[PDB]
Design an enzyme around this catalytic site. Sequence first.
Site, PDB file in Angstrom:
ATOM      1  N   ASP A 128       0.861  -1.189   0.000  1.00 19.10           N
ATOM      2  CA  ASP A 128       0.000   0.000   0.000  1.00 19.10           C
ATOM      3  C   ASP A 128       0.891   1.231   0.000  1.00 19.10           C
ATOM      4  O   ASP A 128       1.589   1.508   0.974  1.00 19.10           O
ATOM      5  CB  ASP A 128      -0.877   0.001   1.262  1.00 19.10           C
ATOM      6  CG  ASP A 128      -1.963   1.086   1.247  1.00 19.10           C
ATOM      7  OD1 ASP A 128      -1.906   2.030   0.439  1.00 19.10           O
ATOM      8  OD2 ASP A 128      -2.885   0.988   2.074  1.00 19.10           O
ATOM      9  N   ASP A 139      -4.417   6.856  -2.980  1.00 14.71           N
ATOM     10  CA  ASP A 139      -4.245   5.771  -2.002  1.00 14.71           C
ATOM     11  C   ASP A 139      -4.772   4.525  -2.706  1.00 14.71           C
ATOM     12  O   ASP A 139      -5.977   4.363  -2.884  1.00 14.71           O
ATOM     13  CB  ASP A 139      -5.060   6.048  -0.726  1.00 14.71           C
ATOM     14  CG  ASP A 139      -4.867   4.978   0.362  1.00 14.71           C
ATOM     15  OD1 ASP A 139      -3.989   4.087   0.226  1.00 14.71           O
ATOM     16  OD2 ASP A 139      -5.604   5.040   1.376  1.00 14.71           O
ATOM     17  N   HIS A 208     -11.964   5.412   3.472  1.00 15.12           N
ATOM     18  CA  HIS A 208     -12.057   6.755   4.029  1.00 15.12           C
ATOM     19  C   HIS A 208     -12.094   7.841   2.959  1.00 15.12           C
ATOM     20  O   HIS A 208     -11.679   7.625   1.821  1.00 15.12           O
ATOM     21  CB  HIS A 208     -10.850   6.973   4.950  1.00 15.12           C
ATOM     22  CG  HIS A 208      -9.547   6.602   4.307  1.00 15.12           C
ATOM     23  ND1 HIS A 208      -8.775   7.508   3.610  1.00 15.12           N
ATOM     24  CD2 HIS A 208      -8.946   5.397   4.150  1.00 15.12           C
ATOM     25  CE1 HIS A 208      -7.758   6.877   3.047  1.00 15.12           C
ATOM     26  NE2 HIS A 208      -7.840   5.594   3.357  1.00 15.12           N
ATOM     27  N   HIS A 216      -6.796  10.836   5.415  1.00 22.03           N
ATOM     28  CA  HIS A 216      -8.060  10.460   6.047  1.00 22.03           C
ATOM     29  C   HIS A 216      -8.772  11.745   6.457  1.00 22.03           C
ATOM     30  O   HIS A 216      -8.620  12.225   7.586  1.00 22.03           O
ATOM     31  CB  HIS A 216      -7.800   9.578   7.270  1.00 22.03           C
ATOM     32  CG  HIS A 216      -9.040   8.981   7.857  1.00 22.03           C
ATOM     33  ND1 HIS A 216      -9.093   7.685   8.322  1.00 22.03           N
ATOM     34  CD2 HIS A 216     -10.275   9.506   8.060  1.00 22.03           C
ATOM     35  CE1 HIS A 216     -10.307   7.436   8.787  1.00 22.03           C
ATOM     36  NE2 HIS A 216     -11.042   8.525   8.639  1.00 22.03           N
ATOM     37  N   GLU A 241     -11.330   0.740   0.298  1.00 21.58           N
ATOM     38  CA  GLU A 241     -10.483  -0.394   0.646  1.00 21.58           C
ATOM     39  C   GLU A 241     -11.196  -1.404   1.525  1.00 21.58           C
ATOM     40  O   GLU A 241     -11.946  -1.035   2.425  1.00 21.58           O
ATOM     41  CB  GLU A 241      -9.187   0.072   1.331  1.00 21.58           C
ATOM     42  CG  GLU A 241      -9.320   0.833   2.651  1.00 21.58           C
ATOM     43  CD  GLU A 241      -7.953   1.261   3.186  1.00 21.58           C
ATOM     44  OE1 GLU A 241      -7.070   0.378   3.299  1.00 21.58           O
ATOM     45  OE2 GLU A 241      -7.753   2.468   3.480  1.00 21.58           O
ATOM     46  N   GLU A 336      -7.239  -1.782  -2.614  1.00 17.35           N
ATOM     47  CA  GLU A 336      -7.700  -0.405  -2.454  1.00 17.35           C
ATOM     48  C   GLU A 336      -7.585   0.425  -3.731  1.00 17.35           C
ATOM     49  O   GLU A 336      -6.666   0.241  -4.538  1.00 17.35           O
ATOM     50  CB  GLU A 336      -6.909   0.264  -1.308  1.00 17.35           C
ATOM     51  CG  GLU A 336      -7.233   1.743  -1.026  1.00 17.35           C
ATOM     52  CD  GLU A 336      -6.492   2.311   0.201  1.00 17.35           C
ATOM     53  OE1 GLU A 336      -5.287   2.002   0.369  1.00 17.35           O
ATOM     54  OE2 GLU A 336      -7.112   3.080   0.984  1.00 17.35           O
TER      55      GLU A 336
HETATM   56  C1  LIG Z   1      -5.882   1.755   9.358  1.00 18.04           C
HETATM   57  C2  LIG Z   1      -6.976   2.790   9.091  1.00 18.04           C
HETATM   58  C3  LIG Z   1      -7.876   2.317   7.931  1.00 18.04           C
HETATM   59  C4  LIG Z   1      -6.422   4.231   8.922  1.00 18.04           C
HETATM   60  C5  LIG Z   1      -6.385   5.066  10.099  1.00 18.04           C
HETATM   61  C6  LIG Z   1      -5.889   6.417  10.037  1.00 18.04           C
HETATM   62  C7  LIG Z   1      -5.431   6.952   8.827  1.00 18.04           C
HETATM   63  C8  LIG Z   1      -5.458   6.146   7.658  1.00 18.04           C
HETATM   64  C9  LIG Z   1      -5.939   4.800   7.670  1.00 18.04           C
HETATM   65  N1  LIG Z   1      -5.935   4.092   6.463  1.00 18.04           N
HETATM   66  C10 LIG Z   1      -4.926   3.810   5.634  1.00 18.04           C
HETATM   67  N2  LIG Z   1      -3.628   4.078   5.677  1.00 18.04           N
HETATM   68  C11 LIG Z   1      -3.159   3.508   4.531  1.00 18.04           C
HETATM   69  S1  LIG Z   1      -1.509   3.481   3.959  1.00 18.04           S
HETATM   70  C12 LIG Z   1      -0.315   4.349   5.080  1.00 18.04           C
HETATM   71  C13 LIG Z   1      -0.698   5.063   6.365  1.00 18.04           C
HETATM   72  C14 LIG Z   1      -0.271   4.750   7.637  1.00 18.04           C
HETATM   73  C15 LIG Z   1      -0.792   5.620   8.634  1.00 18.04           C
HETATM   74  C16 LIG Z   1      -1.604   6.582   8.110  1.00 18.04           C
HETATM   75  S2  LIG Z   1      -1.735   6.430   6.407  1.00 18.04           S
HETATM   76  N3  LIG Z   1      -4.086   2.909   3.779  1.00 18.04           N
HETATM   77  N4  LIG Z   1      -5.197   3.114   4.504  1.00 18.04           N
HETATM   78 CO   LIG Z   2      -6.568   3.926   2.592  1.00 14.98          CO
HETATM   79 CO   LIG Z   3      -3.925   2.731   1.474  1.00 16.95          CO
END
Ligand SMILES: CC(C)c1ccccc1Nc1nc(SCc2cccs2)n[nH]1
Ligand SMILES: [Co+2]
Ligand SMILES: [Co+2]
Length: 355
Positions: A128, A139, A208, A216, A241, A336
């Site tokens: 990812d 993303d 998201h 996000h 996703e 995703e």
């Molecule tokens: C786990 C949960 C769905 C989450 C919580 C808070 C921010 C982003 C995300 N999602 C996400 N991050 C990613 S890739 C890299 C990242 C790591 C931390 C924030 S973004 N794909 N989806």
């Molecule tokens: Co994401």
């Molecule tokens: Co992602």
Amino acid sequence: KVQTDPPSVPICDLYPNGVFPKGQECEYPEEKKALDQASEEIWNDFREAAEAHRQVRKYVMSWIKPGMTMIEICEKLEDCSRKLIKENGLNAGLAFPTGCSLNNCAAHYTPNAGDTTVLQYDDICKIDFGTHISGRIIDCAFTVTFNPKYDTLLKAVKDATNTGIKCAGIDVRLCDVGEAIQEVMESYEVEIDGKTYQVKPIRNLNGHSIGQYRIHAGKTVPIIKGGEATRMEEGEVYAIETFGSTGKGVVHDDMECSHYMKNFDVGHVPIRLPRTKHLLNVINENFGTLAFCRRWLDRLGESKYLMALKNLCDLGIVDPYPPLCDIKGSYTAQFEHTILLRPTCKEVVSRGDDY
Ligand SMILES: CC(C)c1ccccc1Nc1nc(SCc2cccs2)n[nH]1
Ligand SMILES: [Co+2]
Ligand SMILES: [Co+2]
């Protein structure tokens, strides 16, 4: 010119016109034509970021193999990514660190310095990564396997993701997408190493909405029933996703942390502490509100920063995002895509001929 075998020709030099390839355009399940045309430069920015993502991943899929260390996979992917996106500070670059979460670990795992983990033949690795142009973030992620025993698990999640992508649209209630995603997901039953499982969505994980320089942005797209009736609006950008799992269907904080990200809603905070002040300045100049990882700090010549980073985390200026894993022994998969809720249609901008 055209693209070289190992890519190196940035995507903007491959479309001298400045016009970038459009993603797959879908009809939702004149005027709102002018409204769309008005935000063209924006849609285009997303597209440029997407073409980079498509070419970077196609490259990765050509050489990802068991035997390589996780650190080697990420640095090799990121180096190509920086090139094609034609990194330029915060105008063009990597939206976030390369997630390569293994097996029961579903997301947010990227190696820190010294990690000797090596990709194995039986591993189910979720790649990812994101690219952005002026904050317009892409993303998009896929799952990598080498043992076909996971084949049906991967097909289940992929099918669930595209189901969520098809049900999305303006005025669509968010909890219906979730419900839809789950119904497809759980219609799959798999067998891995003699045992059978009915794939279950990781309920505490989800898609998201995406804002500028904000991965996000606020709303969540559930992958299970019982979600909110809040609707998707016109002009919104979403990360669709889904996550399938043979475990409990819930992730928890596990392992050392590697991803970090400045809290988007916090303003200027005066810091007198030498090292903490410096670290924050580095984060503001290099990442702004975009997520980063410890490797990206070492990369900038920064050392002896762990305590400063912690201080920023305790001050609420920076939030840590530790790996999210299901129970030991379980297998997790992910797919995703980023979609654009344009006035004239729904566009899966990160769609490729691959997935
Ligand atoms: C786990 C949960 C769905 C989450 C919580 C808070 C921010 C982003 C995300 N999602 C996400 N991050 C990613 S890739 C890299 C990242 C790591 C931390 C924030 S973004 N794909 N989806
Ligand atoms: Co994401
Ligand atoms: Co992602």
